[PDB]
Chain A
Amino acid sequence: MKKEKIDLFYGALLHDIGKVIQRATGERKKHALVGADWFDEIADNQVISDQIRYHMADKLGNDHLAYITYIADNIASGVDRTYTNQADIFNVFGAQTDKRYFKPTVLNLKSKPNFASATYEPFSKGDYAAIATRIKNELAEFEFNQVQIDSLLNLFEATLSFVPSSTNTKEIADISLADHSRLTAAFALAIYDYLEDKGRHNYKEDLFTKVSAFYEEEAFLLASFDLSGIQDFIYNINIATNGAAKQLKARSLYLDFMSEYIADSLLDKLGLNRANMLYVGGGHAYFVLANTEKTVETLVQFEKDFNQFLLANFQTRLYVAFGWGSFAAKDIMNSPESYRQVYQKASRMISKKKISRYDYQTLMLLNRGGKSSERECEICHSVENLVSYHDQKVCDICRGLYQFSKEIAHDHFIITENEGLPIGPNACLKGVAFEKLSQEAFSRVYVKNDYKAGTVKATHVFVGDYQCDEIYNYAALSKNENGLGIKRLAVVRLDVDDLGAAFMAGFSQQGNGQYSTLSRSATFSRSMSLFFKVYINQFASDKKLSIIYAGGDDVFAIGSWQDIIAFTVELRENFIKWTNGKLTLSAGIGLFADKTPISLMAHQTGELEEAAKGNEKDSISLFSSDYTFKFDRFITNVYDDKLEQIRYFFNHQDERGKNFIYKLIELLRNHDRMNMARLAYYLTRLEELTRETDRDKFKTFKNLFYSWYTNKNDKDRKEAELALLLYIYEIRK
């Protein structure tokens, strides 16, 4: 970027940093000066310190970049032109219930979720010392230039994610300072670029004297892209070897980095940085950028170039469709239509592009025939640039991913010109160990799952990727040390419920849509990123399983079966608490014998998940569409009531009694009047065979069972069938 622009960015990110220094310090001095002075302590930059000092606006004069940062500050919040801690987003999300608040912490990879509590309202200076020093330390010796930007962002992400933008205001109480500053910088640069393109240099006139006139002026694009084909690409493995498993985790991480590299190469073909980008998703991304003709032409051409790259390498398997919409400040608290309809223009441009994909020429060339190929890649059925690898036949892509699966346990990934897996126009993706960095030359470097800034000044990404053993061993690991348990491995697929609806209008119910801002939604996105890309790994800890895909959109995890069910349950109940009950998951859990292929499990478990979404969307489906229960009552009723009772009685019984489980199963599948009689008969028969220690407890249980089986309401006997199943799987040798 131009120097003038670099300074604008830093100004906008760093204004209202006084609030932190001053919350720790507690000085009776206004934050504009605390901030600005402290910045002057550690670096010499008049334009920057100026935007901190006079962000307050203070007619010192000039047509300073301060006048930009000011108006962007106002737009970056719902508010227009005693003390409490940060508020849960889920306070004003959905119905009015209890209000919860966030104790300010710094982000650690290893950590349980930083839950809001209703008893953290009161502000305390203590909590800030930890933070402010960590900030000032890291900015002490710190060059404010282009290449430093993606590290400072991460710093703000790490320390200020739970520091509120304002200590005393109810309107933006819940908007973290990290997001507010980030958003401020986004609009600062976007604005700057708008007036650059339209020649306007009187900032003091336009954004200040005309302040309310500009808010009407459509200077912004909400832009988006969607990378189609990802799930089918990751999970379509037609090999069942040990080796082929490597490809799964590989493919996953690959495309995660593809969506990232699209984001980054786009933002710098434009003049912007990652602060302009709201979210990076399941191969989705949303950006705020200037509404000019330059920017639109760069989007159009970019997209053309990328689908060119994608065509060359993956044929029709991967496609990326962009879309943008135009707006002015219509994210400031018709508000129903306006805020929703800015996202709708890109949404709709993308759908139209996805539904008429290519032109005459590229179809002509795809159908050019000309091959006569005896063989294909065993993994993906490609006939393109085959190679021998390990005495099997694969494409150079699949070969490339075999290589990548070796680089995958590093922390750092670089963007080479030709070294590694193709990631884009004249770019490749290579994981490399730290030492080797100096020995390679690279466009950009990412560090994966590290909040600490490093010597190599890297862009920070966060993937949830827990691994314990390998997929081909998970099924065998389900057998106990005593040889107990069915030898199967399981998959889980789970999804937030009506996530789209939350992102767009979840804040409309309370108030009347006054709480539906852009900032609010941004903060929502961060909540779900955090939950699904950081905290998810902790729920996986000490469990024999691997998280292959993780996001609010889609979570995919495969492991041994008892640990997968434990993982699902731990994940969900954390999610309900984290969300304060205002949002749910549905999940389905597949159960398969060793060596069934990846494609198959993914597909069948996807079907199970849709059955689960098939209830009123709060359900979980395990091993068959028939066993589908509201999560709440599977947890409370199947998992830790009926199953604990069953376990308790039958762990005492011998082979002869354990056999009755089969009868009970049958009778549950054949529910009819007469089989109630038979149920009673074999129940009392069992009671007879049971030892006298449990005779009393078993009396209670026996009659309870017949209760379930006699209810005209079938819910309890369904739960019964499934718990007896769980039990049998649980004991089998």
Chain B
Amino acid sequence: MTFAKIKFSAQIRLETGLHIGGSDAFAAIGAIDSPVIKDPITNLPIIPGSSLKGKMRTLLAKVYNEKVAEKPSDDSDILSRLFGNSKDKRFKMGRLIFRDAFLSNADELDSLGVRSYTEVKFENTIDRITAEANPRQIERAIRNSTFDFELIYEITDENENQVEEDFKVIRDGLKLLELDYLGGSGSRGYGKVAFENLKATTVFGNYDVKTLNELLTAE
């Protein structure tokens, strides 16, 4: 079947504070201990596509890998076809293209009279024998920040059956992110996330999205 490109678009809402975290020297500056990854020009928090891809992939390995794999080259053909496999001639690039997600509602918040788009969260640790506290500050992007989300699916050598299964995998992926967190200190309440206004659109070629859109709005 013919070549086409479908764009999965949504707005990622932060349900709890998100921390991904600064490496870029600009964003590494120690004015706070544990900074968050930020877009250098706007100094706003950014959700790197690499984060989304990585997390969604390792989540989906728990479902779709028959055998648990040591290295990502050992992932199932169903994951490799979507995320890519560097050691397999067929899948050297997956069928998915992630995009860095950027803060959408900065203006909404500026209007509401929000000041910073990050909170500084104070935590501590209690020694189990001495009971003394060692305190800790770490940045989060504030909850109810929203980020414009875009993911591209390419239809090339798939049989319509195959694109259907791929769509199943993508919907499982997004739901699994919703029932997990975006990499942070997740166990301790950080990375909760929601996809709002989740929508598919054919941006190239012809494919018909009606039934997919239904299936996305219901899962």
Contacts and interface: CB of A to CB of B under 8 A. Distances in A.
A624 B29 contact: yes
Nearest to B32: A662
22 contacts: A486-B30, A591-B25, A593-B28, A604-B25, A623-B29, A624-B29, A655-B135, A659-B137, A662-B31, A662-B32, A662-B120, A662-B137, A665-B31, A666-B116, A669-B31, A725-B29, A725-B30, A725-B31, A728-B31, A729-B30, A732-B30, A732-B33
A177 to B, nearest CB: 50
Interface string B6-35: 000000000000000000011011111100
A649 to B, nearest CB: 19
B139 to A, nearest CB: 11
A655 B137 CA distance: 12
A705 interface: no
A592 interface: yes
Given A655-B135, A662-B120, A624 B25 contact: yes
Contacts of B137: 659, 662
Contacts of B33: 732
Contacts of B116: 666
Interface string A455-488: 0000000000000000000000000000000100
B30 A624 contact: no
Nearest to A624: B29
A728 B32 CA distance: 9
Contacts of B28: 593
A659 to B, nearest CB: 8
Interface in B19-55: 25-26, 28-33
Contacts of B25: 590-592, 604, 623-624
A593 B30 CA distance: 12
B43 to A, nearest CB: 9
Contacts of A590: 25
Interface in B87-136: 116, 120, 135
A604 B25 CA distance: 9
Given A624-B25, A662-B137, 18 more contacts: A592-B25, A593-B28, A623-B25, A623-B29, A624-B26, A624-B29, A662-B32, A665-B31, A666-B31, A666-B116, A669-B31, A725-B29, A725-B30, A725-B31, A728-B30, A728-B31, A732-B30, A732-B33
A466 B28 CA distance: 30
Contacts of B32: 662
A353 to B, nearest CB: 38
Nearest to A655: B135
Nearest to B120: A662
Contacts of A591: 25
B28 to A, nearest CB: 8
A722 to B, nearest CB: 11
Contacts of B31: 662, 665-666, 669, 725, 728
Contacts of A729: 30
A591 B30 CA distance: 11
A624 B30 CA distance: 12
Contacts of A665: 31
Interface in A479-503: 486
A421 to B, nearest CB: 35
B187 to A, nearest CB: 24
A450 to B, nearest CB: 41
Interface string A653-693: 00100010010011001000000000000000000000000
Contacts of B29: 623-624, 725
Contacts of A593: 28
Contacts of B26: 624
A667 to B, nearest CB: 11
A725 B28 CA distance: 12
A590 B116 CA distance: 28
A493 B30 CA distance: 22
Interface in A572-612: 590-593, 604
Contacts of A659: 137
B169 to A, nearest CB: 33
A592 B26 CA distance: 11
Interface in A121-144: none
A645 B99 CA distance: 47
The listed residue with most A CB atoms (<10 A of its CB), out of B29, B32, B33, is B29
Interface in B152-178: none
A626 to B, nearest CB: 9
Interface string B46-73: 0000000000000000000000000000
Nearest to B116: A666
A717 to B, nearest CB: 14
Interface string A701-733: 000000000000000000000000100110010
A523 B30 CA distance: 46
Nearest to B43: A669
B63 to A, nearest CB: 35
A33 B165 CA distance: 104
Contacts of B30: 486, 725, 728-729, 732
B24 to A, nearest CB: 10
A590 B28 CA distance: 12
A659 B122 CA distance: 11
Nearest to B29: A624
Contacts of A666: 31, 116
A676 to B, nearest CB: 15
A227 to B, nearest CB: 31
A179 B73 CA distance: 67
B45 to A, nearest CB: 16
A666 B120 CA distance: 12
